[PDB]
Specification:
Order of helices and strands of chain C: HHHHH
Order of helices and strands of chain D: HHHEHHHHEEEEEEEHEHH
Oligomer: part of a larger assembly
Number of helices of chain C: 5
Protein name (chain B): Protein timeless homolog
Family (chain B): Belongs to the timeless family.
Subunit structure (chain B): Associates with the cohesin complex. Interacts with smc-1, smc-3, scc-1 and scc-3.
Number of strands of chain C: 0
Structural class of chain D: alpha+beta
Helix content of chain C: 55-70%
Family (chain D): Belongs to the MCM family.
Chains: A alpha+beta (163), B mainly alpha (656), C mainly alpha (82), D alpha+beta (325)
Distance between the termini of chain D: 90 Å
Structural class of chain C: mainly alpha
Helix content of chain D: 25-40%
Strand order of the largest sheet of chain D: 3-6-7-9-8
Number of strands of chain D: 9
Largest sheet of chain C: none
Subcellular location (chain B): Nucleus
Largest interface: B-D, 43 and 43 residues
Bound molecules: zinc ion
Strand content of chain C: under 5%
Distance between the termini of chain C: 35 Å
Shape of chain C: globular
Number of helices of chain D: 10
Shape of chain D: globular
Largest sheet of chain D: 5 strands, mixed, barrel
Radius of gyration of chain D: 24 Å
Chain lengths: 163, 656, 82, 325
DNA sequence: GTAAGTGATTAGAGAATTGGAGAGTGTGT
DNA sequence: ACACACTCTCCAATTCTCTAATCACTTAC
């Protein structure tokens, strides 16, 4: 109705439904989140017989710890912490797909950026020259990114620690 | 040396805006320049210095526009202008640049000629030379003519040929395909002067034969950038309809952009990971396949073919196009050219062609052969498409059986020389073969049009006897297989192959009708000559050879940019072997299944209504039926046999 | 140097390996022919990737179609059809 | 025949830019004011003069000529801009004399659009809006001095002496990838020619958020702006201005190594990796606004010129004997 | 008309010419 | 030390020519 594009997923409800799925969500967020999204989009399309401008996106919340209690075991796991916002940065463009153009015959190719890396074409399939393409930056596609700085709450801490 | 050129060049005069002012000793300065050009060596130093100083644009053409210019001043100016407007290969004595350093000098000569062409976008120059032409031909009787004026008139005519044979220029900017060319502005000035009527009047005279070949060359070079389809349709417009049409065009563009961007931005996914495809083996031992992006489903996997660099053919064996600067000119230019074509057909064509055909193949010079075949092809296609049936009397020089005979002789000689020689010489002879083939195709189509739509039964009988001769004699029936077996992309263009496919299509339709009406039953064959029954399926079976079907699968890859006629011709030739000879095993082939895969991917982007509305639906439907016939009895050994071209006993043993 | 040739095409990575790959493939004749073609084409690509990883699938199939004219491959096919 | 003696390739076509070029050419050659005057056909006569490079075009006139043409320009402005400049160049050469076509072949010309009503705030410049036509407002903090900038270049092959023309520059100085002579194998040894190259006047400016934009508890944002040609040095610090143009992305060009330039970091938060020019290094980006038009937001001859309303009201005020109170 | 013998055509192999990829080594930052 | 450019060598593809085998035509009963 209002064309909202996200769902806030309260994880306590999921834990009440099934702990066997809650454990998988918290243990592997970088692998399972790209598919629970697709289940939500499938159910939306089946229910309303309709498409939208962007995919409906998940936001899991209400999974609590302290900033000092983190360990190397917690890398790539889901956590939640709290604090005060002191500073925010200006926006950074982050590319997802580049656009190459041949210098000799103006042919043009797209190329996805993934795993942090782009792949450059070597041979032009039209004019059959080699080491020939140039990236055109403003014909390519970007996304927003922002940095936020967060500060410890002073209440919980043991003796002698600064935030 | 070149201090003499620099002394002579700046001593002529200066162009005020709207007026050229002359020094009194222009005559002796031009004599000295001609003397230096005569004595120039293989370095062409004086010629290159004249090209640096831009004599033709700055001085000589504004000088020729002057009213006070006397006889000798005009004469020697025309002499120098002809010598400077000579083509580059003619300056290099016919040899192409065979060397890294020779090419530099060739390019330096060529750019000076390309720069000079915009000097002739003014009607006053053609008006100035038209008076000298009129003085010799119209105002002087044949008993009283002077050899000095004869030589001057020959120089003027050769100058017009050299002007219209200049190449286009890239340095001025890039121009769209739907506006007037820079060639068209010279054409507008030339036609506004009205000198073309004098040239047509000269061409009509039987007595003045030595100018006729050059006048034929001039009119071919005028029609160089056009096609008959541009001029055949009468021009009309209303601006209301034009505004509505352009708004719908940009509506298409906007909707395409929005759909493409939303699809692309919806494609992306947020996070990563790495995954194993259990059930697919890796290169190293005991390994499963591993992927490093969140794949939707296992069939989306590609084995990283996007990385791998494509293999290339060597530089001697790549396909090449031949580019003619071709555009949809404005309604003004198209109307002027349509009137000129009709006037040529009414006043010149029969006499000009009759005078030319005795001489064009005897001469030392090569290029008039190409001009001859081009003008034949253009005029006959224009008559047939414009349906100006009363003009059919005027082109009666080309309708006889002798036209087919002479064309076939010249085409055969060109094909043999192009196949047997090597290099640029082989490409040069193949270029002649292309134009000869196009003229042959127009001959066939024009004779069918006469036999179908003429009002006089005598004309219908005359056309029918020629058509029967073509269908009967072996030389005309064996020609397509003979050319196809000798085709090679090292020495023949893609335009040649497209032309050959269309020619084969029209010829085979003619043979099918003459069999269906029963007019072809028995056929003469060489041994002595003996007569044997003819079978159309036996004739069609010759084209099922692998050495023919290679090129049809080769040209079917370009389906997304071919014309609809060419797509129809390719699909029809495959459809005959598929469902008239009823032999699908010869078409079961992987390199054709790749084309079907591309067509299917192209059709995925359309709704069920738009698919039936599309222009590629014939190719889609043919691919559907052949693939269903293949998968009706699928086996693994059959899938192995799909990897190779299958000969006759291979087809028998696979079938039985 | 290294190049795809008749030894590799007749070797243990070649036509016999493709036959062993194709033994499990069984399309439905009543289904969409373009869908069945897509299913077949990626099995061709899988065999080509295992057989010669350096080159694209398109160029691999072009090279196989070229090498079918050799007498050694013809003799192999004559034996293999039995 | 001689097309194969030459070695040049066929160029692939952008159909959208081609249609935009054709219709913009018709707009320049056909638009009439209500006075039945050809404003742009008049204005193209002035570009022969040495001081002038730009035509100033009102967007409402484009919308009056054709709705979907202006819609296409606003959506795809960065992609379609060189075609508009090409149409302007050819339409100017149609008007020039033989005396002036000598000069006009080198010269760069610009289109300057103005009078958009679609204002956006400075904080709304997302990465979505790269390449579209946008209006913005701000206060100017700095105005850097003037430099010539290279736009199209000519290079001589050191082996064979052939000139290769119209090498279009990116943000970085670039040499051709291939010699124009088809019988020459050079791809590295080149020398620039100055008297054939074309140079562009350039200026860089910084702007700040106006105070009326600011959210709760917030400090103003700043933007870098690029200006070219006839708009150079038209504005001073402390001014408050409206800008029409497009949003662009510029790279960290110091990370790349090519023929003619090695990397400055080698001489003396994660980026993109993979290019041949980026051996181990990585590339990152910044935002900038490429201005198409800038203006400020708000003696007897001048007195005559402010003729009806202003002279009437101000003369009544001057006659007022209690004007102090 | 049919059968046998001889001639011609087609297929394979060997040798020579042309071109391009790959690897190694040297020089400049 | 690392990157980039240049040069040399080898191998594979193509075309011509010679030799052998198989098929078709001609001759004789
Ligand atoms: Zn290219
Ligand atoms: Zn060079």
């Amino acid at each position: 109705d209002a064309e909202v594009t996200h769902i806030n997923l309260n994880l306590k409800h999921l834990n009440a439904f099934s702990e066997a799925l809650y454990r998988k969500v918290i243990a592997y967020p970088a692998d399972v989140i790209p598919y629970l999204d697709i289940v939500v989009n499938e159910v939306f399309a089946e229910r309303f017989n309709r498409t939208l401008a962007q995919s409906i996106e998940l936001r899991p919340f209400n999974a609590t710890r302290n900033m000092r209690g983190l360990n190397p075991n917690d890398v790539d796991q889901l956590i939640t912490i709290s604090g005060m916002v002191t500073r925010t940065s200006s926006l950074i463009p982050e590319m997802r797909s580049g656009y190459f153009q041949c210098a000799v015959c103006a042919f043009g190719i797209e190329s996805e950026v993934d795993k942090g890396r782009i792949e450059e074409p070597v041979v032009c399939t039209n004019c059959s020259n080699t080491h020939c393409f140039q990236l055109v930056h403003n014909r390519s596609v970007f996304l927003d990114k922002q940095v936020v700085k967060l500060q410890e709450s002073p209440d919980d801490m043991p003796s002698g620690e600064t935030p | 040396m070149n201090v003499l050129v620099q002394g002579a060049v700046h001593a002529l005069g200066y162009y005020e805006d709207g007026k050229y002012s002359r020094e009194p000793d222009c005559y002796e300065s031009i004599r000295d320049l001609i003397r230096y050009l005569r004595e120039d060596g293989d370095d062409h130093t004086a010629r290159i210095e004249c090209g640096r100083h831009n004599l033709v644009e700055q001085d000589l053409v504004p000088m020729v526009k002057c009213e006070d210019l006397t006889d000798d001043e005009f004469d020697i100016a025309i002499r120098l202008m002809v010598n400077l407007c000579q083509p580059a290969i003619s300056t290099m004595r016919g040899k192409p640049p065979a060397d890294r350093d020779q090419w530099k000098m060739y390019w330096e000569l060529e750019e000076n000629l390309r720069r000079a062409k915009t000097a002739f976008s003014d009607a006053h120059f053609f008006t100035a030379i038209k008076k000298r032409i009129d003085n010799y031909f119209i105002d002087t009787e044949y008993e009283d003519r002077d050899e000095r004026l004869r030589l001057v008139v020959e120089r003027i005519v050769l100058l017009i040929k050299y002007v219209f044979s200049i190449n286009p220029d890239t340095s001025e900017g890039r121009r769209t395909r739907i506006e007037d060319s820079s060639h068209d502005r010279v054409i507008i000035a030339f036609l506004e002067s009205g000198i073309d009527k004098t040239l047509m009047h000269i061409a009509n005279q039987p007595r003045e034969k030595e100018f006729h070949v050059t006048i034929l060359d001039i009119f071919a070079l005028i029609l160089k950038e056009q096609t008959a389809e541009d001029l055949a349709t009468k021009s009309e417009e209303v601006s209301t309809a034009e505004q509505k049409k352009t708004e719908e065009e940009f509506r298409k563009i906007i909707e395409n952009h929005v759909v493409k961007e939303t699809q692309k931005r919806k494609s992306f996914s947020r996070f990563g990971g790495s995954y194993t495809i259990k059930g697919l083996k890796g290169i190293s031992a005991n390994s499963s396949q591993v992927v490093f992006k969140p794949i939707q489903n296992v069939e989306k996997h590609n084995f990283l073919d996007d990385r791998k660099a494509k293999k290339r053919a060597p530089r001697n064996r790549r396909p090449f196009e031949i580019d003619t600067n071709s555009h949809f000119a404005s309604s003004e230019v198209r109307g002027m050219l349509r009137d000129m074509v009709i006037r040529i057909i009414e006043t010149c064509f029969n006499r000009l062609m009759k005078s030319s055909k005795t001489t064009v193949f005897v001469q030392v010079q090569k290029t008039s052969q190409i001009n001859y075949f081009f003008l034949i092809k253009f005029v006959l296609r224009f008559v047939r498409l414009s349906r100006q049936d009363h003009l059919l009397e005027r082109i009666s020089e080309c309708i006889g059986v002798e036209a087919f005979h002479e064309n076939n002789v010249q085409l055969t000689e060109y094909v043999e020389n192009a196949t047997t020689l090597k290099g640029v010489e082989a490409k040069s002879h193949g270029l002649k073969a292309q134009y000869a083939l196009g003229a042959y195709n127009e001959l066939v189509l024009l004779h069918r049009y006469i036999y179908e739509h003429a009002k006089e039964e005598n004309e219908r009988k005359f056309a029918k006897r020629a058509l029967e001769h073509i269908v009967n004699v072996e030389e005309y029936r064996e020609l397509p297989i003979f050319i196809i077996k000798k085709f090679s992309s090292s020495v023949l263009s893609n335009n040649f192959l497209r032309e050959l496919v269309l020619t084969t299509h029209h010829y085979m339709k003619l043979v099918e009708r003459f069999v269906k009406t029963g007019a072809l039953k028995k056929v003469t064959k060489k041994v002595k000559v003996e007569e044997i029954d003819f079978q159309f399926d036996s004739y069609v079976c010759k084209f099922s050879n692998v050495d023919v079907l290679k090129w049809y699968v080769f040209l079917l890859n370009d389906f997304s940019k071919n014309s609809t006629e060419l797509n129809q011709a390719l699909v029809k030739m495959l459809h005959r072997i598929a469902f008239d000879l009823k032999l699908p095993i010869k078409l079961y082939q992987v390199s054709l299944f790749q084309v079907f895969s591309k067509v299917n991917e192209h059709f995925t982007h359309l709704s069920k209504d738009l698919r039936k509305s599309s222009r590629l639906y014939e190719l889609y439907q043919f691919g559907f039926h052949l693939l269903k016939k293949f998968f009706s009895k699928f086996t693994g050994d059959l899938a192995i046999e799909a990897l190779f071209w299958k000969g006759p006993r291979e087809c028998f043993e696979i079938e039985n | 140097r290294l190049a795809l040739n008749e030894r590799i095409l007749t070797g243990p990575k070649g036509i016999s390996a493709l036959r062993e790959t194709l033994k499990d493939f069984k399309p439905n004749p009543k289904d969409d022919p373009y869908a069945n073609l897509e299913k077949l084409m990626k099995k061709y690509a899988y065999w080509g990737h295992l057989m010669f990883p350096k080159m694209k699938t398109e160029d691999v199939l072009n090279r196989v179609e070229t090498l079918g004219t050799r007498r050694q491959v013809k003799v192999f096919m004559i034996k293999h059809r039995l | 025949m001689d097309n194969i003696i030459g070695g040049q390739a066929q160029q692939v076509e952008d159909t959208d830019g081609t249609r935009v070029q054709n219709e913009f050419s018709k707009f320049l050659k056909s638009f009439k004011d209500q006075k039945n005057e050809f404003i742009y056909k008049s204005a193209m006569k002035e570009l022969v003069q040495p001081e002038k490079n730009t035509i100033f075009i009102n967007m409402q006139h484009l919308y009056k000529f054709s709705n979907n043409l202006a819609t296409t320009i606003e959506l795809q402005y960065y992609r379609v801009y060189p075609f508009m400049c090409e149409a302007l160049h050819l339409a100017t050469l149609d008007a020039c004399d033989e005396s002036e076509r000598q000069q006009m072949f080198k010269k760069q010309l610009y289109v300057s659009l103005f009078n958009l009503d679609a204002k956006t705030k400075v904080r709304e410049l997302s990465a979505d809006k790269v390449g579209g036509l946008v209006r913005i407002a701000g206060q100017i903090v700095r105005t850097h001095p003037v430099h010539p900038e290279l736009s199209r270049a000519c290079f001589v092959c050191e082996d064979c002496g052939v000139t290769t023309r119209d090498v279009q520059q990116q943000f970085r100085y670039t040499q051709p990838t291939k010699c124009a002579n088809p019988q020459c194998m050079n791809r590295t040894r080149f020398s620039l020619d100055v008297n054939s190259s074309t140079f562009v006047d350039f200026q860089k400016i910084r702007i700040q958020e106006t105070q009326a934009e600011l959210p709760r508890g917030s400090i103003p944002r700043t933007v870098d702006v690029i200006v070219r040609g006839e708009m150079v040095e038209t504005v001073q610090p402390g001014d408050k201005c409206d800008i029409v143009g497009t949003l662009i992305v510029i790279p960290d060009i110091a990370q790349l190594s090519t023929p003619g330039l090695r990397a400055e970091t080698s001489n003396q938060s994660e980026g993109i990796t993979g290019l041949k020019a980026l051996g181990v290094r990585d590339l990152t980006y910044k935002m900038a606004f490429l201005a198409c038009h800038i203006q400020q937001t708000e003696y007897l001859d001048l007195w005559s010129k402010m003729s009806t309303e202003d002279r009437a009201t101000l003369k009544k005020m001057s006659d007022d004997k209690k004007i102090e109170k």
